[PDB]
């Protein structure tokens, strides 16, 4: 449950949010495999309700109508093909499992669904599953409205309707079994694990009863007896009635404190300074590292009013975002997820983006292909953060240093900091309003190393900055506060 089941030596996964299956299959072969990425989190592959107002928002995919593999991302054959092709080049697939709920109780009866299944939400009728009224928590929820009226009552949070979505009666074996049958189909196709959407809104024990029914992973690609990787989306920033620790027995848990706190520090809000990161990890009150899934932003909070609010860093804040992602990927805490986004027209009305609904790049509702430019960037308004040099190379850094302890911390008492990972990597940041020019102990063997932030190692040369490390392990680092990327990273495989 806790082990990611990635190929040995691969330590991150990337969220290819709203990507089509054919494009992911390609990306696996041409890019993710060769560049050392461990896996891909995909958008929900099951049939969802079509929302015409607003027009085809990203969030319609969090409103299931059946477990047919038929969505704007593709059909079943395309899904299967993607899973086979990615696994064959060493890149795992993790599915976003939406299992707390079906679609909104107020949606109209009809075949306005991505595969044309019929449903009647007002009658709690989903014949393509099938579910009926006795399969939902209407009778269990104790609130007048039927929704969640207070988050300090765990019963409401779990048994009542989250934003009007029909809440499945997860204590029933029939419902557990229908969900296990869906997940097991996906496991047998070859998926390696699951993000469990909205885990806070389920009882830990009901999730457990579902997980206990799940097949071992497909032995074409995995060792016998392998269990699916589970990570559960529980938003817990502290001082709530439900805690992330209630879910430790099922798998890993999203640690939303991580991005919220890191964003605040990198931005230097609320008195925070990079030097306070000396004890980052359990030292800041985070869950145990072996239970954590971490990330700087996710698909919801990158829109600015989710867990962490305005402090969350994103591709819109490119320069500081790269700093935060860099720090994350260098630091030993947790298992790391990298985000990959699309661009949308933000429109702020009283500190609120009213276009936060907008779905992926599309032609009249049909998702656009991901095009690759000569310079290796993406077109068609896909951001492709995972292809930015600074991020891809820090993904490799994490692979190279995997297993090495945190070591050789230095700081200037403010926002210049550095640390290493055993004797295989070192990274230095300047987030202060003045120059960094200091000779630091790196822990690395003497030699000449390419900085993998400003460039790459190509044959027996570096395309960016080079760092000469003395025989005693020291080197001089000079970073202006006006540097494009105000940090430098060197590792064992960037050595000339
Ligand atoms: O009821 C039919 C209804 O269907 C549509 O959707 C309704 C609501 O869905 C959308 O919300 C999406 C979230 O923005 C998105 O973040 C995600 O949610 C995930 C969340 O971020 C994450 O943390 C987590 O753990 O999982 C969540 C889901 O997986 O996906 C969401 C669902 O698609 C809209 O953004 C949201 O605002 C819509 O809600 C609006 O209408 C509903 C229903 O009236 C309101 O609920 C309230 O009124 C009800 C009246 O009885 C009451 O029962 C309920 O308890 C009240 O809370 C809601 O507050 C309001 O904003 C269409 O949007 C809608 O037009 C259709 O009628
Ligand atoms: O200008 C501000 C607002 O405009 C945008 O939303 C639009 C939609 O995109 C339009 O198509 C239209 O909505 C239609 C809708 O397409 C149609 O289905 C119907 O709605 C049904 C609904 O589907 C059904 O599930 C049930 O609940 O009953 C509804 C019937 O009332 O009728 C709609 C029009 O009444 O209009 C809206 C404009 O409000 C924009 O995306 C919004 O974000 C924005 O607020
Ligand atoms: O299985 C765990 C159980 O926790 C209980 O507190 C809930 O009331 C029940 O619905 C759930 O099944
Ligand atoms: Ca629930
Ligand atoms: Cl998440």
Ligand 4 centroid to residue 233 C-alpha, Å: 13
Co-location of 176 and 294 in the same domain: yes
Q: Which domain holds residue 477?
A: 404-496
Method: X-ray
Alpha carbon nearest to ligand 3 atom 7, residue: 203
Reading the block at residue 242, the tokens are 């439900």
Are residues 179 and 326 located together in one domain of the fold? yes
Q: Identify the CATH number of the domain in which residue 327 sits.
A: 3.20.20.80
For residue 480, the domain's CATH number is 2.60.40.1180
Sign of the torsion angle spanned by Cα atoms 175, 19, 453, 447: positive
397 with 460, same domain: the answer is no
Structure token digits, residue 209 = 């009863």
In sequence order, the 6+-apart residues with CB closer than 8 A to the CB of 188 are 215, 218
Strand partners, 132: none
Q: Look-up: residue for tokens 């000469």?
A: 468
Q: Which ligand is nearest to the CA of 198?
A: 1
Q: 478 and 343 share a domain? A: no
Nearest CA to ligand 2 atom 11: 53
195 is an annotated ligand-binding site residue: yes
Residue with tokens 């030097």: 275
Resolution of the structure in the document, Å: 2.1
| The last residue of a domain, from among 371, 403, 435 | 403
Residues 319 and 465 in one domain: no
Q: Are residues 285 and 419 in the same domain?
A: no
The number of the ligand 1 atom at minimal distance from the alpha carbon of 161 is 55
Which residue's CA is minimally distant from atom 4 of ligand 3? 203
| Judgement on whether residues 373 and 491 belong to the same structural domain of the protein | no
User: HEC states along 23-82?
Assistant: HHHHHHHHHHCCCCCCEEEECCCCCEECCCCCCCCHHHHHCECCCCCCECCECHHHHHHH
Verify that 396 and 411 share a domain, yes or no.
no
Q: Are residues 320 and 453 in the same domain?
A: no
Q: To 10 degrees, what angle do helices 318-330 and 389-401 make? A: 10
- Under a CB-based contact definition with an 8 Å cutoff, are residues 487 and 453 in contact? yes
- Is there a single domain that holds both residue 418 and residue 340? no
Question: Same domain for 332 and 413?
Answer: no
Q: Which of 368, 403, 438 is the last residue of a domain?
A: 403
Ligand 1: atom nearest CA of 103 is 4
Nearest residue to 10 (alpha-carbon basis) of 98, 127, 89, 128:
89
Look at residues 403, 435, 464 and tell me which one is the last residue of a structural domain.
Answer: 403
User: Is any ligand 3 atom within 6 A of the Cβ of residue 139?
Assistant: no
298 is in an annotated binding site: yes
Find out whether 167 is annotated in a ligand binding site.
Answer: yes
Which structure tokens are listed for 265?
A: 């520090």
Distance 102 CA to ligand 3 centre (A): 19
What's the number of domains the chain is made of? 2
């Amino acid at each position: 449950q806790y082990a990611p089941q990635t190929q040995s030596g691969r330590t991150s996964i990337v969220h290819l949010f709203e990507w089509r299956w054919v494009d992911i299959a390609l990306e696996c072969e041409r890019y993710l495999g060769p560049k050392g990425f461990g896996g891909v989190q995909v958008s929900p592959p099951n049939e969802n309700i079509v929302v015409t107002n607003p027009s085809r928002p990203w969030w319609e995919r969090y409103q299931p109508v059946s477990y047919k593999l038929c969505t704007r991302s593709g059909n079943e054959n395309e899904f299967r093909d993607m899973v086979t092709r990615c696994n064959n080049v060493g890149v795992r697939i993790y599915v976003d499992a939406v299992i707390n709920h079906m679609c909104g109780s107020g949606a109209a009866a009809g075949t306005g669904t991505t595969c044309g299944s019929y449903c009647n939400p007002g009658n709690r009728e989903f014949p393509a599953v099938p579910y009926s009224a006795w399969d939902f928590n209407d009778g269990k929820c104790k609130t007048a409205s039927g929704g969640i009226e207070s988050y300090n009552d765990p019963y409401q949070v779990r048994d009542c309707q989250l934003v009007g979505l029909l809440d499945l009666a997860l204590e029933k074996d029939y419902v557990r079994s229908m969900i296990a049958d869906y997940l097991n189909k996906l496991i047998d196709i070859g998926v390696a694990g699951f993000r469990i959407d909205a885990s806070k809104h389920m009882w830990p024990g009901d999730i457990k009863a579902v997980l206990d029914k799940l097949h071992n992973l497909n032995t074409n690609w995995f060792p016998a007896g392998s269990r699916p990787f589970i990570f559960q989306e529980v938003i817990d920033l502290g001082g709530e009635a439900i805690q992330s620790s209630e879910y430790f027995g099922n798998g890993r848990v999203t640690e939303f404190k991580y991005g919220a706190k890191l964003g605040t520090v990198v931005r230097k809000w609320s008195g925070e300074k990079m030097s306070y990161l000396k004890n980052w990890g359990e030292g800041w009150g985070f869950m145990p590292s072996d239970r954590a899934l971490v990330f700087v932003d996710n698909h919801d909070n990158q829109r600015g009013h989710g867990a962490g609010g305005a402090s969350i860093l994103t591709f819109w804040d490119a320069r500081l975002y790269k700093v935060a992602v860099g720090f994350m990927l260098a630091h030993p805490y947790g298992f790391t997820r990298v985000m990959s986004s699309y661009r949308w027209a933000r429109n702020f009305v009283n500190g609120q983006d009213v276009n936060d609904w907008i779905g992926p790049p599309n032609n009249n509702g049909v998702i656009k292909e991901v095009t690759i430019n000569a310079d290796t960037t993406c077109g068609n308004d896909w951001v492709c953060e995972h292809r930015w040099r600074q991020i891809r190379n820090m993904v490799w850094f994490r692979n190279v240093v995997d297993g090495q302890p945190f070591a050789n911390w230095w700081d200037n008492g403010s926002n210049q900091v550095a640390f290493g990972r055993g004797n295989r990597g070192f990274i230095v940041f300047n987030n202060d309003d003045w120059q960094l020019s200091s000779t630091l102990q790196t822990g690395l063997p003497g030699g000449t190393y390419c900085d993998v932030i400003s460039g790459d190692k190509v044959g027996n040369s570096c395309t960016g900055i080079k760092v000469y490390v003395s025989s005693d392990g020291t080197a001089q680092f000079s970073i202006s506060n006006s540097a494009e990327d105000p940090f430098i990273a060197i590792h064992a495989e960037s050595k000339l």
